[PDB]
Point group: C3
Chain length 306, copies 3
């Protein structure tokens, strides 16, 4: 039961917990459609703390807490007393004095788990540098299930920057709970990390690397595209060399399975042609909307109403 | 007839639409003044996306949502994934997955309508560069009609930067829905733009230019003062010639009519002196307050609860 | 008695019965909050949060307070507002009070808050004016002192660090004179307690003594009130790094402290209280912060005519 627990890492997620949570997510989405009265989190305040920029992850948590009848406390680093020199631990300790939950994204990996040590209320990891994005894995798995019917028996193809990409890290790890085959399409420099490729191996999930998107596609049921993480590179030179390696265009999606989904945790810069947007296999915006409902489910369960 | 519609341009309003909207706004303002329950928009969510700075337009939409029982997602460029390089089009379609209505201010003219072209939720233009500001002009006509009892049969003198002023572009072109006269008092390099002038001329309203506040004033019912837009200038030299030229003072006012109002979208820098504000004809603080109630009407009707 | 509609700018305007009532109402709301009693006492009502200097506790605990009463909150920061377009302070404040029923304002120029409230139609609450006052941090400081030790009377409080720049130590020292207290002061000569304050504290008849170090000041301390060396106000960095870190509280110093005693800090801290002190029961600085939410719920409720 997720009640009152730190949500730090995909590891802790039982298959039973995820399915409880997919179910509550489908319930909460029904009531929003039915224009039902949601006073579920009336009284409860969420502390949204972002030290690293966000659009979907911050907006999805905020919209969710609103739509459960809760309130949100906005916290950015730039206008906070961080600027007086406050430590990350003290910032988190203080925001819990006001809030029932803490959503923390931060640029340094393990910072969230480090701050969550002395935190006396549930802290949700919304991204820890290149480490992990746990609720994003959860919504991607929900979306796969939603778009195709099952997750078991599926071939997931992760393309792009796997080294920095905290979403694929979490997502690869978590897809070890489903009978899947993973394929990686990266340049040598941005290959999926060792601990991750080692973790996935030890669960038995068959990993495979490919050089291009042309090769992986015809067997790919789930095509997960990523963004060349420009702000994690040691030098632009390294970045601009890698920028634009893979570019999904409608020409490429003419040898993709009829049954098939293209995802992206967003934002995209170059890596998906806008023309792809019309193909109904493109579910990356539907992926966004799912996120709000899963995060509604997590906030309801972690605060212990569903 | 405004339900589920983008609010992009004043040329999309008719008279019935406006009169309905003002009527809903009086109706909502009374509800607020008696202190009744207001859950007109309970559960619902507005995306507040400002790419330029704002005080009035952002606060009024948010106070408006809040008094209707709704909730607001505050979005900023700076803390957003714009920084990762996400385009305006994605940003607007992604916020719509969380929200029922999108309020967009953008520094590029035509941006908001381009962003609204293929967005599936309603988008309210809250200012698109030197283009338009439809809801300001909607609350300006409201305030005029609130402060004098009519707009029909009146003369309006627009003073300041008319070339850059999106407020006056909207207001002038909308005023031609009434029986009115227009006076223009700017330096030669900031006259009203030509396409806007030809529209007014095409609809058959009097466009008369003038030399100064002194000259237009005697016969002016609405004195609409605007700011010199520093951010809109190429060279500071070109702004510092234009800056502090037209200045309203109590002495200049003694020549005005008793049945007259001075308006200003705000903020002012120096164009109206601080002594002017104690004259009951100073109707610019009541113009902002009216904007909140117009925005309430505007939201409830666009979201189909009035 | 009674702060309905009233501006909240200085602790000079507070009586004892206004504090009592406000402390009482802070307890009433806490418990209603503890019972998940579904509160909508300020449903409809809007607060404008106007911060011209950065914040964490003050902004968040005003914003949490409102939300927990059922009200709304308009966030206002200088950087992304039309302050950028030239707008002066009065205009901004006067504009936000058109939208909102109460205005909380934090500004860097001393006195700019009272001066912006002059011509304002709604209540304006001072959440900090430069190196001047911090009236609602003074109220929550005295609440925490009362809750932590059973009473404020007969206590000696010791204030430590940057007394000169300390907007919260000016309010508190001034406010405390409405009890029977003995004040001890610890600061390097360049950061002593301003002369306006400590003659003001002279007048009301409250003893004052200027101790040389924490260790000397601890034996008889019932409230050790620590403060941050205020970097953003100094000359001159050269004057800052001379002062930065000259008083630091450790678990070793504490082993001579009274048993019935508490350790307070308005926050944040940089290094003046060892993280190693946080597990110590008497370290009340986080309980002091939660307390603030409930105090500032009682402010909003009372200033808007609820209790
Ligand atoms: O940024 C990416 O490329 C992937 C991933 N994206 C997101 O979380 C979406 P957002 O940053 O808009 O909240 C991330 O790591 O932040
Ligand atoms: O900014 C001006 O001077 C005029 C006008 N002003 C406003 O809308 C006021 P604000 O920027 O505070 O929303 C505009 O078109 O931006
Ligand atoms: O910052 C201090 O040292 C004391 C005092 N602190 C506060 O008010 C807390 P905050 O800045 O997080 O609102 C201040 O003067 O700002």
């Amino acid at each position: 039961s997720l009640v009152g627990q730190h949500i730090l890492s995909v590891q802790q997620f039982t298959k039973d917990q995820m399915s409880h949570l997919f179910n509550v997510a489908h319930t909460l989405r029904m009531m929003v459609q039915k224009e039902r009265s949601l006073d579920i989190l009336k009284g409860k305040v969420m502390a949204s703390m972002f030290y690293e920029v966000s659009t979907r992850t911050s907006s999805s948590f905020a919209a969710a807490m609103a739509r459960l009848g809760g309130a949100v406390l906005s916290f950015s680093e730039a206008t906070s007393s961080v600027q007086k020199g406050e430590s990350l631990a003290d910032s988190v300790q203080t925001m819990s004095c006001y809030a029932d939950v803490v959503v923390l994204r931060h640029p340094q990996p393990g910072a969230v788990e480090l701050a969550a040590k002395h935190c006396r209320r549930p802290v949700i990891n919304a991204g820890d540098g290149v480490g992990e994005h746990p609720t994003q894995a959860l919504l991607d798995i929900f979306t796969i299930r939603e778009e195709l019917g099952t997750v078991n028996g599926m071939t997931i193809t992760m393309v792009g920057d796997l080294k920095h990409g905290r979403t694929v890290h979490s997502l690869a790890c978590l897809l070890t709970q489903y009978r899947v085959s993973l394929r990686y399409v990266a340049p040598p420099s941005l290959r999926m990390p060792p601990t991750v490729r080692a973790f996935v191996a030890s669960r038995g999930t068959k990993q495979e690397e490919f050089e291009s998107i042309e090769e992986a596609l015809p067997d790919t049921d789930v095509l997960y595209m990523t963004r060349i993480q420009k702000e994690r590179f040691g030098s632009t030179q390294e970045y601009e060399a890698c920028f634009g390696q893979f570019i999904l265009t409608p020409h490429i999606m003419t040898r993709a399975k009829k049954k098939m989904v293209v995802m992206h945790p967003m934002p995209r810069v170059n890596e998906i042609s806008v023309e792809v947007d019309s193909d109904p296999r493109a579910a990356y915006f539907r992926q966004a909307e799912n996120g709000m409902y899963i995060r509604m489910a997590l906030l309801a369960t972690v605060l212990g109403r569903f």
